[PDB]
Paper text:
Here, we have described a global mapping of structure–function relationships among the members of the tautomerase superfamily (TSF)4 (3, 4). From a structural perspective, the functionally diverse members of the TSF share a small, structurally similar core domain that comprises a β-α-β motif.
Linker 2 shows a trace of cis-CaaD activity.
Residue numbers in the entry:
A (entry chain F), C (entry chain A): 1 to 123
B (entry chain C): 1 to 122
Write the structure that this text describes.
């Protein structure tokens, strides 16, 4: 599971660490993914690089999760909710603004350690 | 709808401002999306971080749209055309080099305000 | 096709150069795509912006390939093989850590030169 986070700049180093750590925790508790398979990446949006509803310079925090298809609806809703709550508890940005997206991948398309697809592993 | 733009370094602040503003317009007018729901993000690619058909240091401008399933072909073709046109008008990079990608998300996978998906939102 | 590389900071200029050039070669050789169609983009992850299995400050190299639907499983496996191998040969990051993802696009979803889709071109 890949968690790619887009945040507007302004967070301290402490907040970044906490955001990524608790996001990883959120994935583990939501869909029961092993920690060894969880990765979080942070992309920071500089000033004027985020247009929100026609407004510049607004706080932003968006989650995108790349994962192998097959998760149940309950798992998806739990994942969206956990990451959204994590983001707000960490950054202070309300869930009304925080967004989370889920992207499905066929096992044949998800390469794994040693450079083979998840289907080849029969993951 | 999320519009994520990847552009090579070199643009002025004014053209950056122009790029995102008109990108927002392109979305509103192509698929009839409410302005309140339209977001545009910009990522700048430094020199040597963009390889174009074997060549480094060439101008780059690529659009990626993340949005919910259900749009007609006409809407989708219009969105691609409008973003391509917008990109050329604001940066000077010809539509021959400009690129637009679309991502369909099922309502079950697209989170909304309040940490709930579009499907659960009903 | 689009090859978007996410890599932790630390690579020299010449290694970044080889990585992009050989990732392009990997695409051309694996799926037989013309050189004129291959694009490679590099996103560099600063310190503390990549969490790997609960640990910060680890080397990271992740490939995401955005491309049109229709490629065979044979090509997909070969592409994942070529990029993973390229990633290690260039950066020195072992294939056990290197990751390659493949993302299918409907022909109507892939904009081409001139602001029309691949489907509109007749592909």
């Amino acid at each position: 599971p890949y968690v790619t986070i887009s945040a507007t700049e302004g967070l301290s180093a402490e907040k970044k660490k906490q955001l990524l750590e608790r996001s990883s925790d959120a994935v583990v508790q939501s869909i029961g993914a092993p920690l060894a398979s969880v990765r979080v990446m942070l992309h920071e949006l500089p000033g004027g690089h985020y247009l929100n509803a026609g407004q510049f310079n607004t706080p932003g925090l968006m989650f995108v999760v790349d994962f192998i298809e097959g998760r149940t609806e309950e798992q998806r809703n739990a994942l969206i909710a956990a990451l959204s709550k994590t983001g707000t508890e960490t950054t202070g940005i309300p869930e009304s603004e925080v967004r989370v997206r889920l992207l499905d991948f066929p096992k044949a398309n998800m390469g794994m350690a040693g450079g083979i697809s998840a289907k080849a592993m029969g993951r």
